[PDB]
Amino acid sequence: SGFRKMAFPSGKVEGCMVQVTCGTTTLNGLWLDDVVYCPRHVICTSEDMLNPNYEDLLIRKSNHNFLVQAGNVQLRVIGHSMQNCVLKLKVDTANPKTPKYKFVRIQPGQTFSVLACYNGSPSGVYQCAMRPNFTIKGSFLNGSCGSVGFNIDYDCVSFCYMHHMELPTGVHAGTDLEGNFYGPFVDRQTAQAAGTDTTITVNVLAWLYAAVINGDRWFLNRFTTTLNDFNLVAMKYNYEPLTQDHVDILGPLSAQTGIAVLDMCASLKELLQNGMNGRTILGSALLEDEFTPFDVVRQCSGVT
Amino acid sequence: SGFRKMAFPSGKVEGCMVQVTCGTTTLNGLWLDDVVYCPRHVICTSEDMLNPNYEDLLIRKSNHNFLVQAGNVQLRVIGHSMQNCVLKLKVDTANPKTPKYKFVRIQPGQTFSVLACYNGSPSGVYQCAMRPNFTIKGSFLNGSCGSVGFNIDYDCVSFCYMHHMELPTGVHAGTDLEGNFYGPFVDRQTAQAAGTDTTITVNVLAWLYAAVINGDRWFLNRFTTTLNDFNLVAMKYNYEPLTQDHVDILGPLSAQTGIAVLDMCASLKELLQNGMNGRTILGSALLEDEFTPFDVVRQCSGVT
Numbered sequence: 091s092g093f094r095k096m097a098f099p100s101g102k103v104e105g106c107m108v109q110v111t112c113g114t115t116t117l118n119g120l121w122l123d124d125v126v127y128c129p130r131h132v133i134c135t136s137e138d139m140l141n142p143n144y145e146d147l148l149i150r151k152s153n154h155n156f157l158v159q160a161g162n163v164q165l166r167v168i169g170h171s172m173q174n175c176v177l178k179l180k181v182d183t184a185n186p187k188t189p190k191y192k193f194v195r196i197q198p199g200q201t202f203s204v205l206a207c208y209n210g211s212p213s214g215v216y217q218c219a220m221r222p223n224f225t226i227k228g229s230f231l232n233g234s235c236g237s238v239g240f241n242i243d244y245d246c247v248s249f250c251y252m253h254h255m256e257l258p259t260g261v262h263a264g265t266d267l268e269g270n271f272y273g274p275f276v277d278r279q280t281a282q283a284a285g286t287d288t289t290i291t292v293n294v295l296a297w298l299y300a301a302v303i304n305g306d307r308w309f310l311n312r313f314t315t316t317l318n319d320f321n322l323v324a325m326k327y328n329y330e331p332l333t334q335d336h337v338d339i340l341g342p343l344s345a346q347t348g349i350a351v352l353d354m355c356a357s358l359k360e361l362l363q364n365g366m367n368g369r370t371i372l373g374s375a376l377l378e379d380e381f382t383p384f385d386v387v388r389q390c391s392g393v394t
Numbered sequence: 395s396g397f398r399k400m401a402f403p404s405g406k407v408e409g410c411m412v413q414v415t416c417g418t419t420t421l422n423g424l425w426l427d428d429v430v431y432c433p434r435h436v437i438c439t440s441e442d443m444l445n446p447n448y449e450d451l452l453i454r455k456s457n458h459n460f461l462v463q464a465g466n467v468q469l470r471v472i473g474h475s476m477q478n479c480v481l482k483l484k485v486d487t488a489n490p491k492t493p494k495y496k497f498v499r500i501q502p503g504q505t506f507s508v509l510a511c512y513n514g515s516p517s518g519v520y521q522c523a524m525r526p527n528f529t530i531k532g533s534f535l536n537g538s539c540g541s542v543g544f545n546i547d548y549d550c551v552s553f554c555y556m557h558h559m560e561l562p563t564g565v566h567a568g569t570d571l572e573g574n575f576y577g578p579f580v581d582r583q584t585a586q587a588a589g590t591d592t593t594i595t596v597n598v599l600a601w602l603y604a605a606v607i608n609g610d611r612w613f614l615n616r617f618t619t620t621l622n623d624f625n626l627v628a629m630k631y632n633y634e635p636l637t638q639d640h641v642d643i644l645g646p647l648s649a650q651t652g653i654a655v656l657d658m659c660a661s662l663k664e665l666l667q668n669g670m671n672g673r674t675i676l677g678s679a680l681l682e683d684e685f686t687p688f689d690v691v692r693q694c695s696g697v698t
């Protein structure tokens with residue numbers, strides 16, 4: 091019993107983190123097979139960042155300008171290319187600790203673990219969600235760029251995020267491992283404002299199910315609702331609309347707890363309208379939206 | 395910028411987790427050097443758990459009754475002993491992935507990472523605190539016993555916790571790696587009630603400092619207080635008393651932010667008396683007490 095914001099075990103990803111230096115810029119790279127993936131802004135001065143032309147900056151860079159260190163051993167760079175906003179550095183050594191892996195572009199609402207790294211060295215691991223405005227609310231200091239977000243399916247690491255920048259509001263933007271930013275962000279030190287950070291309704295519902303499973307039931311009410319009625323309330327409260335796809339995804343939690351999805355919706359409706367009245371659910375005074383239905387099933391069933 | 399509940403990277407501990415089976419009971423063990431440490435209740439039936447005599451139960455057990463599996467390879471058990479509430483299984487192979495390690499008994503308020511494991515396989519990692527009533531609020535299902543709590547100092551894992559049981563209230567109790575329970579708990583399926591789960595005041599203050607550092611300042615007020623005045627309010631609100639030792643520990647955060655500890659105390663006082671008024675601090679609607687001053691310095695400075 092009990093329900094915790096839980097990251098994936100980080101060992102498989104720890105074994106992939108390296109330091110990438112280009113001139114005076116040091117950040118993290120991800121070493122998979124004989125390729126080191128890192129943010130392309132490794133080639134920039136903080137001056138360059140104001141208005142970088144990456145193709146033009148990259149012309150001035152040779153393989154030997156990319157210093158790649160894995161532990162305290164230097165890797166030989168034998169090729170480099172830009173793919174969108176990441177550099178792929180070909181090295182002469184396959185990472186012997188390469189896990190089975192995929193590159194996946196996640197949808198907003200999807201959760202993943204971040205292994206925060208500095209100089210290629212893991213400092214910590216935490217659980218994040220792709221916000222509906224395609225930001226994440228991370229913990230990233232200067233040097234943390236190239237830290238990666240990931241999910242694990244048994245023995246396969248799906249890399250979904252690489253850290254690139256902090257917006258002036260101190261929320262985070264980055265790319266998939268093909269170098270494509272989540273959302274409209276660019277790797278340039280310019281005014282970039284996030285859109286509305288809406289609540290991930292399907293994640294809140296999952297977490298309400300997690301609460302019932304773990305004995306926190308005080309918020310269960312006598313009401314039901316409809317998707318349309320619920321959605322009017324959701325919209326008013328900057329919650330994402332709930333679709334029948336979301337209702338389908340919650341089916342197993344519905345079945346386990348015997349609480350119809352639309353009944354749990356009506357409970358959430360009353361919580362939005364009435365607030366918590368100083369009460370907590372699973373030790374939180376606000377409605378947690380950084381657990382997916384899959385996350386709740388995983389943690390409640392003990393998947394390894 | 396940003397501040398996350400952050401666990402230590404788990405790789406060093408993942409490399410130590412094994413499955414221990416005695417008859418029909420399977421749980422996790424920690425393999426360090428040629429010793430596998432696991433909860434002594436591995437020898438119990440759920441019937442035994444009602445009133446176990448462990449010395450008497452252990453007489454019926456030989457080395458070959460302890461089945462130790464590391465990945466999908468069996469370790470040979472060549473000795474076993476009971477130390478308090480843990481078994482030490484001597485194996486003929488030193489764990490080749492043994493990190494530098496210590497066994498440490500932590501104080502209440504102290505935070506650590508848990509690597510939740512089932513059948514010796516890591517499922518997840520989360521950050522905990524030893525509650526002032528010597529419980530922890532974990533996420534543990536049947537099979538999770540022998541999962542360990544730890545801190546990392548650069549390359550040295552300090553193991554502080556091994557999971558043993560869930561109280562009827564669904565909070566958790568366990569031992570240090572010498573097998574001594576935190577608090578008054580016993581490895582017996584009997585009524586065991588926790589004492590008052592008070593708030594770890596020094597941890598709240600650290601986290602208020604973390605909030606100021608990361609730009610959340612709305613709660614800073616125009617007041618100061620004294621340790622005695624603050625403590626009267628703290629006591630009333632089931633907060634632990636603040637000592638001069640706590641004030642000393644917060645000194646560096648005080649210095650970094652230019653906010654005197656007693657001023658931050660007066661801010662916390664007003665938050666207790668006035669509540670959050672629907673506002674959040676670092677994305678929380680309640681005052682977080684599971685970051686130590688050391689945790690706040692570490693995450694705010696990016697230690698690896």
Ligand SMILES: *CC(=O)NCc1ccc2c(c1)OCO2
Nearest residue numbers: 115116117232233234235254
């Ligand atoms: C996010 C990141 O690490 N990018 C590279 C970088 C940015 C700013 C900065 C440093 C590195 O070092 C000091 O300041």
Ligand SMILES: *CC(=O)NCc1ccc2c(c1)OCO2
Nearest residue numbers: 419420421536537538539558
């Ligand atoms: C906490 C733990 O894993 N202890 C051993 C154990 C207790 C209950 C239980 C099982 C193992 O398997 C099923 O139920």
